[PDB]
Specification:
This is part of a larger assembly, with 9 protein chains of 9 kinds. Chain B is of the alpha+beta class. In chain B, the strands form 4 sheets. Chain B has a 4-stranded antiparallel sheet, with helices on one face. A 3-stranded antiparallel sheet of chain B has the order 1-6-5, covered by helices on one side. In chain B, strands 2-3-4 form a 3-stranded antiparallel sheet, covered by helices on one side. The radius of gyration of chain B is 21 Å and the shape is elongated. By secondary structure, chain F is mostly beta strands. Chain F is built from 1 helix and 6 strands; from the N terminus they run E-E-H-E-E-E-E. Chain F is globular. Chain F starts with 9 loop residues before the first strand and ends in a 7-residue tail after the last strand. Chain H is of the alpha+beta class. In chain H, strands 2-1-3 form a 3-stranded antiparallel sheet. A 3-stranded antiparallel sheet of chain H has the order 5-4-6. The chains are: A mainly alpha, B alpha+beta, C alpha+beta, D mainly alpha, E mainly alpha, F mainly beta, G mainly alpha, H alpha+beta, I alpha+beta. Chains in contact: A-E, A-I, B-C, B-D, B-H, C-E, C-H, D-G, D-H, E-F, E-G, E-H, E-I, F-H, G-H. Chains A and I meet through helix 1 of A and helix 2 and helix 3 of I. Chain E binds 2 RNA strands through helix 4 and helix 7.
Chain lengths: 62, 190, 141, 42, 203, 108, 79, 174, 196
RNA sequence: AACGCGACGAUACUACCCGCACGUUGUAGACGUAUAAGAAUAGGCUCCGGCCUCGUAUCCUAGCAGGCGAUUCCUCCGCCGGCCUCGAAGUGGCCGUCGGUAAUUCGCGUAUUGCAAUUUAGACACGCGCGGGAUCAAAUCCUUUGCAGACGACUUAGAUGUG
RNA sequence: CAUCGGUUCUGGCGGGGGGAUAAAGGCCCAGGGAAUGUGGCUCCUCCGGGAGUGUUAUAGCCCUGGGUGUAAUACCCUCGC
C-alpha cells in the first residue's frame, strides 16, 4: 500500500485540490463572504493619522 | 606540485559580446543573452588579445589547473548557444497504443508544457514543464518527432532528459516493451 | 567582438620590483628563489631605507609600485646601486603615499606633552574655522 | 565545419588539447641531447 | 587590547568555534559581548558534515524521560552559537554563570544594534582562515533544515534594515562631501603659521 | 568650564591567581593592563603600585569605599600580563573586576 | 547509505585502561616472540646486502662511473 | 635537522709499532655541532672501515663555509633512506643559497613527505648543478624559467594577534 | 507572532463583561468604563490611531467575538469570548471589515454553509482518576492475581533502573483538548423557522 | 518553560504620576566606560579627480573636579514645545523659545590636604520625605452548581434579576 | 622615600680573543668562460612582441689568482660598566 506520506499520493491529492475541490470551495467562499459583507455594510498628531507613541531588556544597562 | 602559472584561451566571434564582472559571465549574441555565475572557481579573467579571452590560475594545484578546461568549455558552450543555438530532436515510438503529445505555452509563466497521453494505454496524463528559454514544436517533416530548441544547452538537454524519464516503463520486460520517447538527434539550430 | 573584463590586477614579484620590509627599508628584487623567498638588495644612501643583500621572505615584505627597468637577474650590488640611483628610487618612494603615512606616524610618535597640548590648541583654532565654513555651506543648501 | 564524428555525440565540443601542465619547461633539442647522454651512460 | 562598555560583533563571515573561543575568553575576562547575525556564521567543511553532526546530536536524549535532564536540541543559529560558547566556559560554576550573563546573541540585527558599530574578529574570519577551495556551510541554512522556523522573517527584516541603511549611507556621503568642501574652503582662512605648525606636527 | 577627564591611572583587569591546571595560589594575582600586549611593554609597569577599589556596606571613618594596595612584581607569559602582589590576596569573586595601576613610583 | 539523515551509534575513540594495558602486553609479547623466531629462523641470508646503486636521474652518474674506473685502475697500478 | 653546519672531520687509527703512520680519513658531516659531527664520523667509520672510537683519534674538525652564500643555486641530493621495506635510493633537487640550507630543506622535506627521521637518512652526495640543463625536476624547472614573474593572489594581511577586534573588514589584495 | 494592539467597541454587553470577573455580583462593574470615554475624547483619536497602527504594521487580523449565552437554556450568564481570524483580502480590508463588524451579531450561516466539512475543537468528557485497563486498554491479568489484576505486570523489567515515560500508568482520563477534523454539516437550521 | 514573552481591562491604600531631597540601600564591578553603510575578498571605494596593508584612524580633549569679571565669537551643547518619523524587544530628524559655552587675549582667586594614601564624583534599581496632580478596585473563604472531582483544583450562580 | 646587605629576574653599553686571522661583500688589478644572450645585425607579425646569430658593445653574470686587508659582520668564548 502507498502511505499517506507518499509522493505519488501527494501529487494525486494536489491535482484533486487544484482541479475539483477548488472551484467548489471558491464558490462557497464567495457566497459566504457576500452574505457577511452584507451584514457588515448593513494636525496628524491631534487626529491620529500620524502614528504616535501609545499613552527584561535587549541591551545592557547604560 | 603547485604550478606557478597556467592559462587557457577562448576565441570570441565578431558578433558576440562578452562581459565578465566578479566572475559573472554574460554572453550576448544574435540569438539572445545568457548568464553564468562562475564565482565558485578561482580564475583570473583577462583580455590577452583582440577577440581572445585569457584564463589564468596562479600557484594552483593539478585540480585547480584542470578546472580551467571546464570553465573554457562552459563559456564556449554559452557562445555557441547565443550564436548558433542548440537543438535536440526526439522521437516517440509505440507498438499498440499511439502516444498523444500536446505542446502548449503557459501565458503566465512563459514556459512550454508537454502533455503525454495514452502511454501504453495509461489513463494518466503526464505533464512536463520545460525550462524557460526552451521552445518545443511537433515536427512536420518527420513522423512522431519533437524538436526542442534554445540558447542554453543545459536547459535544452535537461528538458529532453525530463521528457525521456517521464515515460518510464515499470514492471515489464524491456526486451519486449519498447515504448517511449528517446533523444534521436543533437545539434545546432543554425 | 568587444570584450569587457573586470578582474584583479595584482602587483608582480619580478626582478626590479622594490619591496618595503617591516622595518621600513626598501630592497629591489635581484633573483627569485621560489614562490615564498627572493634575493633582495637595498643599496640606498639613506640608512633608513637601506637593506643588506640577502634572502627576503615574501610574507615579510610588501610590493611597492616602483619597478627598476631593465635590471638584470643576479646583478651584484654595484650594478643594482647604479640602477637605483639612475632610476631615483628614493625620490619616488618619498612621493608614494606609504612613506607619507610612515612619516605621519613618526611625527605623531615623536610628540611630547607640550607638543600634544599645542596640537590640541591649533586643531581647535582650525576646527573653529572649519566649523564656520561648514555652517556657511549648510546654510547655503 | 568539423569533418570527424565525436563518439558521445556532443558535436559542439571543441578540439581539445592534451592536459600537459608541465609543457614548455624543456625544449626538444635539449631532450634529444639528454636522451643520447642517458643512453651512453646506461 | 582595549576595554569597552560592550562589543557588538557582526557574526557574518566568522567561524563558529574560533569566534566562540575568543568570545568565551572575553566573557571570562570581563568584557560584555553582543553577537548579531548569527544566521550568517560559518562552519568549515561541507554542509552534510554539519547536518550529520546535528543529526548525531539529535540522536541523544534521556531514555526514561525526554522532558527532563535530556540534551535539549535548540534549532536556532544564535542558540547553536550559544551552545558552542557555553561548552567553552565552566557554566556550572558561579563565575561561569556570571560570564554567561555578559553575553547576548541574536538573529539578524535587532534595534538598537542596527545603529551601533559592529566589529569583526580577524582570527575567526573565514576569508582570512580557510584555504581557497575548501568548502564551508551556513549555520542559518543548517538551522532551516533542522527545524528553525524564522529564516524568511529574519530575511525580510534584514532587507528592510539594509534599505534604511542605504538611505542613511546616502546622507552620510552627502555629509562627507560637505565636510571636505568645508575643509577646503576654510583652509584659506586659517592662520598660515598654524597650518605649517600642524603640518610639521603631523596633523 | 573644563570638560576633560581626570584619569591619572591605567586601567587593568584582575584575571586569576597564579595557578597550575588544578592548584591555585592566591598570594600572586594576574593583571591584564590595558594597551600592554608584550613583555617589553610590561617591563615599564614593573614596581608600579596597583589598587583594587571596592564598596562596602558600612561607613567606616567617613567612607564606604575600601582599597587593597599592592605592587606589580614581574611580567607573566608573553602577552603583557603582569604578576601582582597585594597586601592581602584579592577576593576570588573579583575575577574580571577592574584595578588601577598608578604611574608612581616613577622613574621618568 | 542514509548516514547523514539517520546516523547510527557512534564508534568511541575513547580508550579504556584495561584495553590499553592488554594491547601493551600483547605488543611486548609479540616483539619477544619475533626476537625468538628471528633467532630460530632457518631462512638463508646473504653476508653482503644487494646495494641498489646510483640513480639514473642523478646528472653526474657518468662522472661517478669515470671516477670509479679511475680509482680501480689506480688501485690496480698501486697493488 | 636544526641550524646545521658542514664539518670536515679527519680522523685516524691510533699509531702502533706495526703501523707507525696510519692512513687518515676525511668526511663531510652535516651536524648541529662538533660533538654530533665527531659521533657521526665515528659511526660512519664503524660502518665502513671497522675502526672503533677507542682505537682511533680525531685529527681535525673544521667548518666548511659556503663560498658564495649570496648566490642562488640549484642542488642535487642523492640519498638513501630506510623504511620497513628496506633501503631506498632517492634523488631530489633543492633551490637554495648554501649546501647547509639545502640539507636542512632536504631533512624537512623527507620528514614531511616520507616521515623519515635523521637516523634513517644517509646523505650520499650533495652537488651544485653547474648548468640549467642539469635541472631535472619540474618544480625547479618552472623556477629557472625565463623572465619569471608571478602575482600573489589572496594574501592574508599581517594583523597583530593581540588586536582582537577590528572596525573594518580586511582585504586580501596586497 | 506578537500581538501589537487591540481595539474594543464602545459598548460591551453585561454577559461579555462577566468574562472579566469572578465575583460580578459583588463588583462595581467598572470594566471598560474609562475605555468607553476615549471614543468621545478627541473624536476617537486614540481609537483611530490604534486602527491605523494595525493597518500599517500588522499581518494577521482577528476579531474578538462572544456568545449570547442568554439565548441558550444554560444557567451560566458569563459568555465565551474568542479571537476569530479574518482571512482573505489585504490588511486594510481586514481592519475595515472588523471595524464595520463592531457591535454587530454574526449568524452561523454566514460563516459556515450546508454540505461543508469543518473541524470541531472541544474538551472531552471527564472520567477522573482511572486505572490502566480503561485508561490505556491493557489486557487484564488472570483471576485472583496477587496485588491486583487491573494492572500491568512489568513496568520496568529491563534497563535503565527507571520507569519509562512510555509505560502505561494510572491517572487522569478524559477532559483532554481535542481537534477533530472533517465533520460534514448536514443542516443549518434557523431559529425563527417553525419547521426546521 | 510553574524563574520565556506580548496585548488589553479595572486598579480602594501607606497604592499611582510629576518636581526636588538625600540615602551606614543594593548591583560579576563607570572614570571620554564616544564612533550604524551594504557588499566582495581571483576584488572593492569614490567627491569621478582619484584612492585601498595598516583604527598607529576619526570625534572629543585647556579654565577652583574647573570660580568671578572683562575682551571677544555666533561655534558647540543641553532642557522643553510644535510638526513629522521610528514596531525585530519601538526614537530619532527638522524648526522655535530659553539657558550655558576661550575660536583670541587679560586681571583677580587658588597656598596650610603640610612629601603619597579611591580622585568618596557615573548609570540603573530600591527606600524614606515633603509640595502638587489623578482614581475610589478586586480576589479568597462561605452558600450553590456537576459540563468537574480522591482531596485540592475546575465549569457556574449568589447585589432586584430572562434572579 | 633615600642609602646598604643577601638572593634573584630582566634591559642596555664599552672592550679582548678565535675560525679559511670567519666565509661573504664593496672598489681596483690580471686572466678564462658561458647563457634563462645586453647592444648590434637578419627574418616574421596581430606592430604588441617572437626566432636566429654571437661574448659586452647603448645591460650584466660566472670561475681563478692578487691588493686594500690584521677590512667589516655573523657565530662561539671571554673582561668589565
Amino acid at each position: 500500500a502507498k502511505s499517506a506520506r507518499a509522493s505519488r499520493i501527494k501529487e494525486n491529492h494536489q491535482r484533486f485540490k487544484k482541479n475539483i475541490a477548488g472551484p467548489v470551495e471558491a464558490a462557497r467562499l464567495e457566497r459566504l463572504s457576500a452574505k457577511l459583507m452584507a451584514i457588515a455594510q448593513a494636525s496628524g498628531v491631534k487626529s491620529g493619522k500620524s502614528i504616535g507613541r501609545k499613552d527584561s531588556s535587549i541591551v545592557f544597562p547604560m | 606540485m603547485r604550478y606557478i602559472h597556467s592559462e587557457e584561451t577562448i576565441p570570441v566571434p565578431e558578433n558576440v559580446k562578452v562581459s565578465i564582472k566578479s566572475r559573472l559571465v554574460t554572453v550576448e549574441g544574435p540569438r539572445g543573452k545568457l548568464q553564468k555565475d562562475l564565482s565558485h572557481i578561482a580564475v583570473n579573467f583577462s583580455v590577452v588579445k583582440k577577440g581572445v579571452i585569457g584564463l589564468e590560475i596562479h600557484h594552483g594545484s593539478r585540480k585547480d589547473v584542470a578546472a580551467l578546461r571546464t570553465v573554457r568549455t562552459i563559456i564556449n558552450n554559452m557562445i555557441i548557444g547565443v550564436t548558433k543555438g542548440f537543438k535536440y530532436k526526439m522521437r516517440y515510438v509505440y507498438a499498440h497504443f499511439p502516444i498523444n503529445v500536446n505542446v502548449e505555452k503557459n501565458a503566465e509563466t512563459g514556459c512550454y508544457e508537454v502533455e503525454i497521453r495514452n502511454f501504453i494505454g495509461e489513463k494518466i496524463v503526464r505533464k512536463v514543464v520545460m525550462a524557460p528559454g526552451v521552445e518545443v514544436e511537433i515536427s512536420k517533416a518527420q513522423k512522431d518527432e519533437l524538436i526542442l530548441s534554445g540558447n542554453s544547452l543545459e536547459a535544452v538537454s535537461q528538458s529532453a532528459a525530463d521528457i525521456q524519464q517521464i515515460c518510464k516503463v515499470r514492471n515489464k520486460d524491456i526486451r519486449k516493451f519498447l515504448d517511449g520517447i528517446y533523444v534521436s538527434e543533437k545539434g545546432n539550430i543554425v | 567582438a568587444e570584450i569587457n573584463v573586470e578582474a584583479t590586477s595584482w602587483r608582480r614579484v619580478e626582478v626590479g620590483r622594490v619591496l618595503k620590509l617591516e622595518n621600513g627599508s626598501l630592497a629591489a628584487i635581484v633573483e627569485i628563489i621560489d614562490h615564498k623567498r627572493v634575493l633582495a638588495d637595498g643599496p640606498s644612501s639613506d640608512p633608513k631605507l637601506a637593506t643588506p643583500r640577502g634572502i627576503v621572505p615574501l610574507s615579510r615584505a610588501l610590493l611597492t609600485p616602483i619597478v627598476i627597468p631593465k635590471l638584470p637577474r643576479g646583478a651584484r650590488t654595484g650594478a643594482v646601486k647604479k640602477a637605483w640611483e639612475a632610476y631615483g628610487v628614493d625620490a619616488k618612494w618619498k612621493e608614494t603615499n606609504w612613506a607619507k603615512k610612515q612619516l605621519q606616524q613618526e611625527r605623531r610618535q615623536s610628540l611630547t606633552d607640550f607638543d600634544r597640548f599645542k596640537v590640541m590648541r591649533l586643531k581647535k583654532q582650525r576646527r573653529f574655522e572649519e566649523r564656520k565654513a561648514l555652517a556657511k555651506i549648510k546654510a547655503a543648501a | 565545419k568539423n569533418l570527424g564524428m565525436r563518439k558521445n555525440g556532443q558535436v559542439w565540443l571543441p578540439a581539445k588539447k592534451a592536459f600537459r601542465p608541465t609543457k614548455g619547461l624543456t625544449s626538444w633539442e635539449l631532450r634529444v641531447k639528454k636522451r643520447q647522454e642517458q643512453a651512453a651512460m646506461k | 587590547s582595549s576595554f569597552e562598555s560592550v562589543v557588538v560583533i557582526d557574526g557574518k563571515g566568522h567561524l563558529l568555534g574560533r569566534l566562540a573561543s575568543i568570545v568565551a575568553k572575553q566573557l571570562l575576562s570581563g568584557q560584555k559581548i553582543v553577537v548579531v547575525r548569527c544566521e550568517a556564521l560559518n562552519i568549515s567543511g561541507e554542509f552534510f558534515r554539519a547536518k550529520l553532526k546535528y543529526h548525531a546530536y539529535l540522536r541523544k536524549m534521556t531514555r526514561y524521560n525526554p522532558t527532563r535532564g535530556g540534551p535539549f536540541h535548540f534549532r536556532a543559529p544564535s542558540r547553536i552559537f550559544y551552545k558552542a560558547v557555553r561548552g567553552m566556559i565552566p557554566h556550572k560554576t558561579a563565575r561561569g554563570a556570571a560570564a554567561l550573563e555578559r553575553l547576548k546573541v541574536f538573529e539578524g540585527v535587532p534595534p538598537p544594534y542596527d545603529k551601533k558599530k559592529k566589529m569583526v574578529v580577524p582570527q575567526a574570519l573565514r576569508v582570512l582562515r580557510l584555504q581557497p577551495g575548501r568548502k564551508y556551510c551556513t549555520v542559518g541554512r543548517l538551522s532551516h533544515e533542522v527545524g528553525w522556523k524564522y529564516q524568511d522573517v529574519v530575511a525580510r527584516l534584514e532587507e528592510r534594515r539594509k534599505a534604511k541603511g542605504a538611505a542613511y549611507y546616502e546622507r552620510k556621503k552627502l555629509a562627507a562631501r560637505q565636510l571636505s568642501e568645508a575643509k577646503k574652503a576654510a583652509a584659506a582662512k586659517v592662520d598660515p603659521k598654524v597650518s605649517e605648525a600642524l603640518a610639521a606636527y603631523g596633523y | 568650564p573644563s570638560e576633560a577627564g581626570h584619569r591619572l591611572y591605567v586601567k587593568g583587569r584582575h584575571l586569576s591567581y597564579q595557578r597550575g591546571r588544578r592548584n591555585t595560589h592566591p598570594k600572586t594575582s594576574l593583571i591584564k593592563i590595558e594597551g600592554v600586549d608584550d613583555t617589553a611593554a610590561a617591563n615599564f609597569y614593573l614596581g608600579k603600585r596597583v589598587a583594587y577599589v571596592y564598596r562596602a556596606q558600612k561607613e567606616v571613618r567617613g567612607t564606604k569605599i575600601r582599597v587593597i594596595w599592592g605592587k606589580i612584581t614581574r611580567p607573566h607569559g608573553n602577552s603583557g600580563v603582569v604578576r601582582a602582589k597585594f597586601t592581602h590576596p584579592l577576593p576570588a569573586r573579583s575575577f574580571g573586576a577592574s584595578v588601577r595601576i598608578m604611574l608612581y613610583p616613577s622613574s621618568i | 547509505a542514509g548516514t547523514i539523515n539517520k546516523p547510527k551509534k557512534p564508534t568511541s575513540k575513547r580508550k579504556t585502561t584495561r584495553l590499553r594495558a592488554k594491547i601493551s602486553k600483547r605488543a611486548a609479547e609479540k616483539k619477544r616472540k619475533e626476537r625468538k623466531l628471528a633467532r630460530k629462523n632457518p631462512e638463508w641470508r646473504s653476508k653482503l646486502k644487494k646495494d641498489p646503486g646510483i640513480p639514473n636521474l642523478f646528472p653526474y652518474k657518468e662522472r661517478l662511473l669515470q671516477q670509479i674506473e679511475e680509482e680501480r685502475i689506480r688501485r690496480k697500478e698501486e697493488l | 635537522m636544526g641550524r646545521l653546519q658542514e664539518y670536515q672531520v679527519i680522523g685516524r687509527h691510533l699509531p702502533t709499532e706495526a703501523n707507525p703512520n696510519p692512513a687518515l680519513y676525511r668526511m663531510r658531516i652535516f651536524a648541529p655541532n662538533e660533538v654530533v659531527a665527531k659521533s657521526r664520523f665515528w659511526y660512519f667509520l664503524r660502518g665502513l672501515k671497522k675502526v672503533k672510537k677507542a682505537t682511533g683519534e680525531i685529527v681535525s674538525v673544521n667548518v666548511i663555509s659556503e663560498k658564495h652564500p649570496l648566490k642562488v643555486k640549484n642542488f642535487g641530493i642523492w640519498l638513501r633512506y630506510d623504511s620497513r621495506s628496506g633501503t631506498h635510493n632517492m634523488y631530489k633537487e633543492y633551490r637554495e643559497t648554501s649546501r647547509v640550507a639545502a640539507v636542512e630543506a632536504m631533512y624537512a622535506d623527507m620528514a614531511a613527505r616520507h616521515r623519515a627521521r635523521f637516523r634513517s637518512i644517509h646523505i650520499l652526495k650533495v652537488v651544485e648543478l653547474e648548468k640549467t640543463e642539469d635541472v631535472k625536476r619540474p618544480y625547479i624547472k618552472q623556477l629557472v624559467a625565463k623572465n619569471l614573474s608571478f602575482p600573489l593572489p589572496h594574501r592574508v594581511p599581517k594583523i597583530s594577534t593581540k588586536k582582537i577586534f577590528s572596525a573594518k573588514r580586511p582585504s586580501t589584495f596586497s | 507572532l506578537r500581538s501589537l494592539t487591540t481595539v474594543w467597541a464602545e459598548h460591551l454587553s453585561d454577559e461579555v463583561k462577566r468574562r472579566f470577573y469572578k465575583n460580578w455580583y459583588k463588583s462595581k462593574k467598572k470594566a471598560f468604563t474609562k475605555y468607553a470615554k476615549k471614543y468621545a475624547e478627541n473624536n476617537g483619536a486614540s481609537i483611530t490611531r490604534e486602527l491605523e497602527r494595525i493597518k500599517k504594521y500588522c499581518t494577521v487580523v482577528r476579531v474578538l467575538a462572544h456568545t449570547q449565552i442568554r439565548k441558550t437554556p444554560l444557567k451560566q450568564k458569563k459568555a465565551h469570548l474568542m479571537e476569530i481570524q479574518i482571512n482573505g483580502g489585504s490588511v486594510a480590508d481586514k481592519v475595515e471589515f472588523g471595524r464595520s463588524l463592531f457591535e454587530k451579531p454574526v449568524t452561523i450561516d454566514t460563516i459556515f454553509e450546508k454540505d461543508e466539512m469543518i473541524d470541531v475543537i472541544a474538551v472531552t468528557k471527564g472520567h477522573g482518576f482511572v486505572g490502566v485497563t480503561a485508561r490505556w486498554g491493557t489486557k487484564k491479568l488472570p483471576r485472583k492475581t496477587h496485588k491486583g489484576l487491573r494492572k500491568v505486570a512489568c513496568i520496568g523489567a529491563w534497563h535503565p533502573s527507571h520507569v519509562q515515560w512510555t509505560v502505561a500508568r494510572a491517572g487522569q482520563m478524559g477532559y483532554h483538548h481535542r481537534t477533530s477534523v472533517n465533520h460534514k454539516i448536514y443542516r443549518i437550521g434557523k431559529g425563527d423557522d417553525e419547521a426546521n
